[PDB]
């Protein structure tokens, strides 16, 4: 309505800022949506979590169930487990909501890992945006820890065992402080009356707020410093090619948010996850093969499993094996934000860049990325020892030794292999740039020869051989049908053809539109 | 350091917007700091609440104390009260921190009330900033509800009785819906196992986050739309007079924050507040004169007390008296944001204003404000009837009747009195405008007369009687010492004088500086 707009303009006078923000242009590429996925997952996590807070009771006082689940009647149990079972069975649909929460958290972890991997591959971590990389590393670490605190609130015996092992062992194993930190955290011995309320408060109050504020900071930094773009025809280090915000960009974001909510709901309702009722209340005397916690902190458990038993004994003191695990995880923590400075000092490059590099052009960085991903994968699969030996009849000791040799002998092999792979990809791209696109058609040449009939991508010499081009980092169509190859079928939909005039007019309009678009892009 | 500044400039290129905000000018007046105090109190509440969450346990399962307070050993009690006692007595300084938290909450309530009163008096709620007034009303209501939820977590006799009475009676007394809302909130009957955890979650998560977001929105709105200013010599509806940020504004804000933290800490350490250990664990069978909850919702209790017992009985139904109390509080809630619309559609004014009006200029608005404040004061003091009858030997029934009759008869009296008061203030201002301000000196006039010897404030006619000036809504001195007549004594510190030349130089320098400042302000 005109009246409301006139009143708003007269009151707040927002014209330039609205015009400035609304006319902004975003780069268009499929790899550039791997952050909105995580942000939508985060929104889902927040809404589900703010719902779940109305039916919990974090208490360690022993009580009797006498509820609805008959097989667990008359068993002394923690109050928090009782509240969890209540929200899982007594409240209409609570199980659905909590399963959605857990599945969305897993989606968040997977999305953040994928986004970090994509950012590392593209090499946008150079001088203009290094603080953004440091913030992203800190976000990853805090999100991982908070997610670790997630599955521990319904203190069943599995989560109790996991938290007991991790916290009690690593905290008490500190060479110098040791007992002080554990006693500060638990208030005395390991089983404490204040542990669960403290964990609940930390999981609902501090970490989510810090994470949200830092996500806002990250989004603001990526908003001000303009986004990068892949090399292309009309792309240059002083401009950005894409689409405007209002007509397209926001609509796509909303559609993507709806789509991720839909897939999350479908898969959460289809798949059971963490059936605590099947488990039992946590007690120190009960233990079983139930192990292998959530997969986004699983590398710590794998490292604990794989480490050889080395110990040192001096005057009335003893440093156990897990201290090495703590040292390794701390080193991994340190290395993640320190990578840009290390690379800058190693290569001695201090130039600004707004254009990314395709993965096949930098063998060294891709090799280091393969190094890291192979190490992470072998650490992750090593702690799957129980399930691997169970489903597939393999010796537990044999698989342990396979991992023990794998994390040391596998990395160099894949490093060398991916180095050769990148070199070969570069050579293939050069060969494609030299000659024409292989059309896959052969001629008999009555004198008796067979030729390939290359299709040149541009100018040719006086003899018909294509004039060699120059590599510019732009992708090229490996397959002939990718470019040109006019083969659009008739104007029908599924069973009946349309008028020939309509089909001809549509073909002319489409060809004219595509030709005008490419001509405008090339001229600009 | 120069290198860091150069790197920061080369990376994010921020100079323009930073220069824009850093050159902002803020109005200078003591009444303009009554919001900074509330914000600083809010910061104190947030930090303390972050601390307190690490030692609490909101559970209603009965337990035994067997702690350290001997007069409370071996008594059945709620877990939350045990955790509160632990925080109060078994942690070094925990009682100090919780007392600081409670005192800070009271500070916040009083500060927001005073700030709202000053805003209402100054009349800044006109067309340019109406949405700010609506947001402020929402902030007041939400903060009041949050404060009500505050003192209820340590479910002692006082908090239990207050929450029982208020929530149970009001919710169950709803005419149409009634029992549905109460059963949804408590999960069945009044004493529920889920009530306290739900209240704890609502007190830590939803309301504080919403309040912080809305406070940020209000601060942003007052940042963009420039602040108003009192009328003065060099003040006009198209400019703002004050000081810049860097040398004064931020430094004064930090000093005020330190001072408010100091007064909070001192008065918290001196005054005992809410001694729950002296109280007992909540039980339905224990009750006494302990009543009159926190003083920022005490008006609801007073309204409940003074209301006459009117009831209606039709076919198998009954509407109790407190429904009228609910109607009154709902109407009070409704009227607070709707006042500017009523004023603008009553007086027929649709003009922009950047300059405020002094309180004595507008009689009607001041009269309505006196109406409201007198009503609030008489309602609040009515609820404190028991202490009135106790400390001062007065009849309880007599005091109740006095409050009941005064709620009707007092408002018109104070309304008329303040109307006359404002008219008299305007008359006095006109009189002091007509003639020179009285010097308090009389002369014998040997012919036999006595004269005041007025000191003219400006132009003087041929007769020596100053010509009448014009009123510009600007304050004027009423005492000779307010203007420079005789001041600045010797240059000594407390016991020993200085050199005469130094004192004379200081005097002339100060006079020259003040005259230059006044001339620059008046000419420009």
């Amino acid at each position: 309505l005109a009246r409301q707009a006139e009143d708003i303009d007269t009151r707040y006078h927002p014209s330039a800022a609205l015009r400035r923000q609304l006319n902004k242009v975003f780069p268009t590429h499929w790899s550039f949506l791997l952050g909105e996925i995580a942000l939508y997952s985060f929104v889902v996590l927040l809404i589900t979590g703010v719902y779940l807070t109305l039916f919990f009771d974090p208490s360690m006082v022993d009580v009797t169930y006498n509820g609805v689940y008959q097989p667990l009647r008359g068993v002394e149990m923690s109050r928090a487990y009782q509240s969890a079972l209540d929200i899982s069975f007594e409240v209409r649909g609570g199980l659905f909501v909590r399963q959605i929460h857990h599945w969305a958290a897993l989606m968040f972890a997977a999305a953040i890992m994928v986004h970090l991997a994509r950012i590392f591959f593209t090499g946008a971590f150079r001088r203009p945006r290094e603080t953004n990389w440091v913030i992203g590393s800190l976000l990853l670490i805090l999100a991982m820890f908070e997610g670790y605190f997630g599955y521990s609130l319904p203190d069943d015996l599995l989560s109790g065992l996991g938290l007991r092992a991790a916290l009690s062992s690593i905290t008490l194993g500190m060479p110098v402080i040791g007992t002080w930190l554990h006693w500060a955290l638990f208030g005395g011995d390991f089983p404490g009356t204040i542990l669960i309320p403290r964990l609940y408060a930390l999981h609902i109050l501090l970490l989510p707020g810090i994470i949200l504020a830092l996500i806002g900071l990250h989004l603001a930094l990526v908003w001000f410093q303009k986004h990068t773009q892949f090399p292309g025809p009309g792309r240059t280090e002083h401009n950005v090619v894409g689409v405007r915000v209002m007509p397209v960009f926001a609509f796509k974001s909303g559609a993507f948010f709806a789509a991720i909510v839909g897939v999350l709901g479908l898969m959460g309702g289809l798949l059971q996850i963490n059936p605590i009722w099947n488990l039992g209340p946590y007690k120190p005397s009960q233990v079983s093969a139930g192990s292998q916690p959530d997969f986004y902190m699983m590398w710590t458990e794998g490292l604990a499993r794989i480490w050889p038993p080395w110990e040192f004994y001096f005057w009335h003191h003893t440093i156990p094996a897990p201290v090495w695990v703590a040292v390794i995880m701390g080193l991994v923590f340190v290395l993640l934000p320190a990578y840009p400075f290390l690379e800058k000092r190693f290569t001695g490059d201090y130039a600004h860049h707004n254009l990314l590099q395709r993965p096949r052009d930098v063998p060294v960085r891709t090799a280091i990325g393969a190094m890291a991903i192979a190490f992470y994968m072998v650490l992750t699969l090593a702690a799957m020892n129980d399930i691997i030996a169970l489903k597939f009849h393999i010796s537990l000791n044999a698989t342990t030794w396979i991992g023990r040799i794998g994390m040391v002998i596998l990395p160099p092999f894949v490093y060398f292999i991916t180095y050769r792979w990148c070199i070969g990809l570069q050579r293939s791209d050069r060969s494609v740039l030299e000659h024409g696109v292989e059309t896959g058609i052969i001629k008999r040449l009555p004198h008796g020869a067979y030729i390939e009939l290359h299709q040149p991508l541009g100018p040719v010499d006086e003899h018909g051989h294509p004039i060699p081009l120059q590599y510019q980092g732009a992708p090229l169509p490996k397959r002939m049908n990718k470019l040109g190859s006019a083969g659009s079928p008739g104007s029908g939909s599924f069973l009946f053809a349309d008028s020939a005039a309509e089909d001809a007019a549509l073909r002319e309009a489409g060809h004219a539109a595509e030709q005008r678009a490419l001509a405008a892009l090339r001229e600009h | 350091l120069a290198r860091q500044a150069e790197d920061i400039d080369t990376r994010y290129h921020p100079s323009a917007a930073l220069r824009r905000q850093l050159n902002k000018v803020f109005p200078t007046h003591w009444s303009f700091l009554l919001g900074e105090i509330a914000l600083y109190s809010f910061v104190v509440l947030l930090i303390t609440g972050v601390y307190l969450t690490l030692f609490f346990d909101p559970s209603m399962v009965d337990v035994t104390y067997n702690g350290v307070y001997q007069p409370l050993r071996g008594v059945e009690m709620s877990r939350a009260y045990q955790s509160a006692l632990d925080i109060s007595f078994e942690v070094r300084g925990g009682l100090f921190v919780r007392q600081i938290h409670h005192w800070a909450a009271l500070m916040f309530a009083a500060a927001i009330m005073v700030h709202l009163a000053r805003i209402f008096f100054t009349g800044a709620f006109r067309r340019p900033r109406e949405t700010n007034w609506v947001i402020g009303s929402l902030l007041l209501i939400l903060a009041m509800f949050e404060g009500y939820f505050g003192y209820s977590l340590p479910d002692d006799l006082l908090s239990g009785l207050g929450l029982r009475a208020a929530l149970s009676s009001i919710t169950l007394g709803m005419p149409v819906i009634g029992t549905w809302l109460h059963w949804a909130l408590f999960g069945g009957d009044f004493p529920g196992t889920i009530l306290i955890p739900r209240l704890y979650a609502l007190h830590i998560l939803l309301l504080p986050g919403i309040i912080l977001a809305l406070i940020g929105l209000h601060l942003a709105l007052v940042w963009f739309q420039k602040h108003t200013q009192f009328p003065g010599p060099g003040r006009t509806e198209h400019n703002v007079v004050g000081v810049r940020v860097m040398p004064v504004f931020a430094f004064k804000s930090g000093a005020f924050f330190a001072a408010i933290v100091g007064v909070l800490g001192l008065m918290g350490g001196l005054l005992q507040i809410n001694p729950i250990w002296n109280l007992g664990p909540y039980k339905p069978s224990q009750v006494s004169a302990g009543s009159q909850p926190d003083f920022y919702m005490m008006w609801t209790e007073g309204l409940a007390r003074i209301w006459p017992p009117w009831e209606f009985y039709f076919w198998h139904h009954t509407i109790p008296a407190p429904v009228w109390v609910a109607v009154i509080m709902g109407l009070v809630f409704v009227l607070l944001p709707a006042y500017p619309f009523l004023e603008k559609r009553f007086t027929g004014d649709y003009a922009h204003h950047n300059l405020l009006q002094r309180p004595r200029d507008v009689p009607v608005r001041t009269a309505i404000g006196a109406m409201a404040i007198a009503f609030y004061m008489v309602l609040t003091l009515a609820a404190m009837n028991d202490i009135i009858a106790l400390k001062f030997h007065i009849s309880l029934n007599a005091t109740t009747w006095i409050g009941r009759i005064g709620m009707v008869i007092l408002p018109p009296f104070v309304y008329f009195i303040t109307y006359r008061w404002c008219i008299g203030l305007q008359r006095s201002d006109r009189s002091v405008l007509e003639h020179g301000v009285e010097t308090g000196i009389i002369k014998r006039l040997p012919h036999g007369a006595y004269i005041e010897l007025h000191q003219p404030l400006g132009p003087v006619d041929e007769h020596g009687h100053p010509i009448p000036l014009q009123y510009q809504g600007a304050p004027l001195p009423k005492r000779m010492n307010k203007l420079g007549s005789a001041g600045s004594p010797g240059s000594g510190s407390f016991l020993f004088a200085d050199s005469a030349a130094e004192d004379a130089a200081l005097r002339e320098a100060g006079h020259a500086a003040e005259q230059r400042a006044l001339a620059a302000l008046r000419e420009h």
């Binding site: 330039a16 | 009957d189 420039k226």
Partner: protein, 161 residues
């Protein structure tokens, strides 16, 4: 710190006309480029779908708190009645003997003890609670929990003057 006086030059009021024209033109072109003004069916379908999804989502979200205050959950001597209609004094099998047991405040001794008419005075005020002899003294876990449950009842306490 030196004192200073400055002037801000508000530049308040309505925005510059050129910016308003540019914003209005941009919004109008963006809105009318979709040609949705001449598709009533598409807009109607979008509105119906959005409304249905919103109402279903809000109903599902709000379904975790609704409870019936009128369902029979408490057993009585005349069937089962709602909580609001009972106070713990209702007989359960038509002839129960309930003593006006008074509180004691001791843990070793029973929390409640029976009451005799002679043990009163002309101006004595006492507090009593239902006993339900089948409850038993506070020795076993079940008896102790039942005694605590009867202790925590809003409509239980009764004066006897």
């Amino acid at each position: 710190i030196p004192e200073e006086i400055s002037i801000q030059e508000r530049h308040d009021g309505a925005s510059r006309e050129i910016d308003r024209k540019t914003v209005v033109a941009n919004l109008t072109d963006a809105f009318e480029g979709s040609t949705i003004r001449r598709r009533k069916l598409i807009g109607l379908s979008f509105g119906v779908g959005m409304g249905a999804f919103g109402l279903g989502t809000l109903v599902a979200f709000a379904g975790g708190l609704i409870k019936n205050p009128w369902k029979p959950v408490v057993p009585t001597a005349e069937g089962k009645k709602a909580v609001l209609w009972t106070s713990g004094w209702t007989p359960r099998y038509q002839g129960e003997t309930i003593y006006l047991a008074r509180a004691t405040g001791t843990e070793d001794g029973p929390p409640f003890i029976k009451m005799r008419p002679e043990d009163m005075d002309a101006g004595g005020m006492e507090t009593v609670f239902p006993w339900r002899e089948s409850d038993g003294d506070g020795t076993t876990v079940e008896s102790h929990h039942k005694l605590q449950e009867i202790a925590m009842g809003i409509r239980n306490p009764v004066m006897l003057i």
